[PDB]
Symmetry: C5
Subunit: 307 residues, 5 copies
């Protein structure tokens, strides 16, 4: 197996789409191996630009095609360079831009912690023909920098593994294991924007929903509760286009359903308080001192869902 040494340089990470769970990565890839010796002009290495590698491959040069596994669409490749050394080593440097997809579990959505993953693998050559020696990821541009609301924390984790492909077993009987490289970059979401734009006004609106019990008219209590219900329905509008449709509920979604439940429970309590009239003369004194009990219970529920 030919030993190929890969070096991935990340120019920038951008376009992190949480709705589609994709992210755009731009960078360079440098794959270096050793072949048969050749005579270059002088002792200097020979540089072959893009659309001139085709002539050398037609002449019979072995240049493998290293594809990206977790990419969405054909990765937009830029310029490509081939350095041929007189001692025999061949270096392939290419510029890639790709939309890559990862798992991205959004349980703690504003306080999220994800990893951007690049998977690289030969398309045609198994580990009995091509083997990855080592990889160094030069993530120096985005080392500790803020790509939007994404603190790229730490360095890049590098892994070389072997993947047994089963659909190639019928065409390659006992040799269908491919060498793979995984690059993992740990990122933390910046929660500030959601903290001052989605969590704080919803909390104020839920407190204002608690404020319906300080009125002295049941009909005005219902009208106030319905206006605040309309306000909460006005929310979760521009919340639905900040995260995808997940089976589970996040902090902002729990706060939206908590506001709905608080408003419907306030409506139910005032309806039952007016229903509590035994003979049309009993007023509401014990049942409407929940101005300091309903917010206390809601704060206890919020503490339970937070922790």
């Amino acid at each position: 197996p030919v030993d190929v040494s890969v070096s991935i340089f990340i120019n920038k990470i951008y376009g992190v789409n949480t709705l589609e769970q994709t992210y755009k990565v731009d960078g360079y890839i440098v794959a270096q191996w050793t072949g048969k010796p050749r005579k270059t002009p002088g002792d200097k290495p020979l540089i072959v630009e893009n659309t001139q590698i085709e002539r050398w491959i037609n002449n019979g040069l072995w240049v493998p095609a290293l594809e990206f596994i977790n990419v969405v669409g054909s990765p937009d490749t830029g310029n490509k360079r081939l350095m041929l050394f007189p001692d025999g080593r061949v270096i392939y440097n290419a510029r890639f831009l790709g939309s890559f997809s990862n798992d991205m579990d959004f349980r703690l959505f504003p306080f999220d912690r994800q990893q951007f993953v690049l998977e690289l693998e030969p398309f045609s050559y198994n580990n009995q023909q091509l083997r990855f020696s080592d990889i160094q990821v030069y993530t120096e541009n985005i080392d500790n920098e803020e790509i939007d609301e994404w603190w790229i924390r730490g360095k890049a984790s590098t892994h070389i593994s072997d993947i047994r492909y089963d659909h190639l077993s019928s065409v390659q009987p006992n040799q269908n294991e491919f060498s793979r490289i995984t690059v993992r970059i740990d990122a933390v979401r910046n929660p500030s924007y959601y903290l001052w734009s989605f969590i704080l006004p919803l909390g104020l609106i839920i407190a204002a929903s608690w404020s319906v019990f300080w009125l002295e008219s049941f009909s005005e209590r219902l009208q106030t509760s319905f206006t605040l219900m309309l306000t909460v329905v006005a929310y979760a509008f521009y919340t639905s286009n900040i995260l995808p449709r997940l089976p589970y509920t996040t902090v902002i979604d729990q706060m939206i359903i908590a506001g709905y439940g608080s408003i419907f429970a306030a409506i139910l309590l005032i309806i039952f308080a007016h229903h509590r009239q035994a003979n049309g003369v009993e007023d509401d004194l014990l049942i409407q001192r929940c101005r300091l009990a309903f917010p206390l219970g809601f704060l206890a529920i919020g503490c339970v869902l937070v922790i």
Copy 2:
């Protein structure tokens, strides 16, 4: 007819657009057949990378073009590989990414059950020249996994059929039947997000619309009903962009029209109750005890439309 054995490997299924009834499938296709024997370097099979298959096809190698029938746009093909064996068998391995379209009937929209279908067919060779022997679909990455709100349940169903094309009858008189492969993957939608985000708050709002009959002022009853009508009109806004424009009505659409009907019926009942004054002195006692009759009738209607 040359017997071609196809193996389709599905890397991921993503981008399931319910509005356009398309879905993006990425994977590999391995078509294997047998031709005339040839002399490769050594006894080892010869691997021909992408843009080097053109030279072999120009020399006269028979490589058929297997197209996708139900694809939307030209399928973005990645790397392609040609394994030539000394015994004579030729293997063509290609990476595809395509937007595929299927029927996708949305009667039970949150509790939906669809199938993703891949149709594969030779473009030029009929069943008297090319015949598909068998297909194995290696759907191991998405075997039991949750692509968004889509439980990929079960394995993949595989079918080989013959399609008689009639527009090719004039150019091919009695031989216009093409071998086709259909791959069907059964998927179930995850109903949780719609259950806690679209069905529960609409149900609470419809209950709050029932709550208008507990007031003691007809004018305030009308004002409350109009505010709740505005709230229901605020709904069906971000419901219209979750499913396409279908001729029939789904569960969420039936609940929206049921809320509209409940609010308009409440308005009609309170208008008729104030109209029920025979001489300006008759109040509303029998006609306004529908606080436990109107919700009961609505629950019966909801049970009828559910089952």
Copy 3:
């Protein structure tokens, strides 16, 4: 002139954009003509796949370029096939996907009746060099089927005409007439979705706007009218993105302006009724019995605009 027989097969019609007046058509085109006799391998016809037609055209084969006239953008062509027969006839089969644009007049917008038109023409050869003999359109997949809200009714109308191009008169003095083929497919919009989602709730809201005259307080009448005005302003929001910006008004637009006029007229009538107080003591008895006159007049106006 070489006689070319064209056969167009429509796989599917999809993506009918009413806002841009475009629609995506996928299918196959089979152009058949007769040239000089040639010697193929055996007596069997020779099949030339895609990117192998270039060698035959370089050798000197006459293959015309049939373009689409009413297409938006370069039509995404898939695989192309060239059947060469020993008797001399040449057949060109290509797979196309194109965004085609038509007139699409939207006077009766929910109950609309349009036709999807495909125009095909040689790019370079006039009718003194290439002439279309006949066309058969094999619209069998979408014969009587429901592409979204579009009942494809009937068969396909086929026409061959001659178009005199004037910009080519200076370069071709008396021979600038090009043979053209027009394919017309009649389609009817499915009005059900708009009937239960845009027309019915607007009608209920306009009836609820009539319901303001049953109140017994002028100030509450104004407040109710302003809330219902806000509800109608909440409508025409997700109506503006279902059809383009047309100079004329459709049924839904007439209903929106009719709701605006009904609400403003109700406001004007209640303002004038309170203005009708001659000395501060005259109430409203004759002028506020329009609870059965204003809806009657609005229904008459709706009957006039419907028919």
Copy 4:
């Protein structure tokens, strides 16, 4: 300098994006010049289709590259044709589709009057090598037709000018002037849709905002004014996505700010009227007869801003 005669035929103008100030133009371009005589098959002109012009250019034929100056992106070129005449004249006919950008000043936005401009220029040859003789624009399909809300009025104005490029002065010392052709098509926007959809309901809402002074309760006056303020805030929502973000204010924007000013001024007047109580007993008689003075002043202001 070689004299090149250009003829531009416009098939359709569509996709006029006011937000991005671009518009899509599809058509044909016919550039005709005269070179050295050549021997074609017979005395008939020789037609060279697309991807066969490359062989003739490789053999040494002079075919200039005429680019579009004001285009956005690479113009999608379709089929291209080369007519070679035995007398020596060469004709190049190409089909283009391009997104072109123009100035598009939107002062009178619904009653707008713009011009669509196509600029054409050789990429490499200055006026000492290539010179445009004359241009005829055959705008016969869109002569007097309604591309959406765009009355294409009149014919096309044609201009040939010389542009001195300064960045090419260092590489071409005294010869850096390029021949350019400008095509201008005058278009008028159809104001009907905005007239019945954006101007009329806003005017009705502003009249309804004047209608707050006919109430007999200051608190109800404030509540009514705040509801109408909410209605005006509901407007300018789907007005913000019909025109770009311009430094100046258009008619619809002036009407929106006029509605805001009318509502805030009504609030200020009723607040000052209740503040006008000298000792808690003075009512509002002189200050609240502005039901025919405030609308008169607003109509005067609207007449000033209209003319």
Copy 5:
């Protein structure tokens, strides 16, 4: 090292996306250097159009590939020209259109001041093989012009630097420094649109929120405050799609949170004023004279956040 002189001409800057921090730049690039002397036809320079440079590069001509560093996606290149002079100098003129990304810090968002940056670098040749001599940027079309809300103020700053690349150290031991050119264009945002569309109506609405203390009914005060809370919640809707999700707060965002705080503080003050009843008889006289104290404090806070 070969000395390359670069001249960049900017045709237009457009499509400045603040949400994605990208901007589209269209222009020409002219790279001029000197090589070995060659014999052209006559003493005149030889012009090589696009897709004819490939033959000269195949013959062995040295044409470097100058890439853009801060570009998003492959830059759409148009026509390319190669001027070969008999004295030996080679000139490469290409037309580029690219989406370029810059930092773009949005602290003072309506009154913003950014710079559009173009970074240019050889892909393969270090400073021991290619060195940039000087660059002149001919920004004459957009010298003092208004690209949308972007006053392009001043001229273009030009810089030539050396960048040490570390991922190329293993393949190039002591020679991994690349010559780079940075072009910086200073631009100022036009604040007018936000001034009359987002800042002025929000300020009027906050003043109207101050106007709740002039009422004489606590229940009506709460209802008015909740309606105005709904109006502020209606704002920040079409504010969220004018700037990206930034960790910090801008002027418009501070005004939105200031309106939320003013409304919640007004609610809290009126609740506490009604709570201030010691024995059910004490009214509100001292605590409700904040009609000229609460606006004064809010104006002081606005002055603090402005400066």
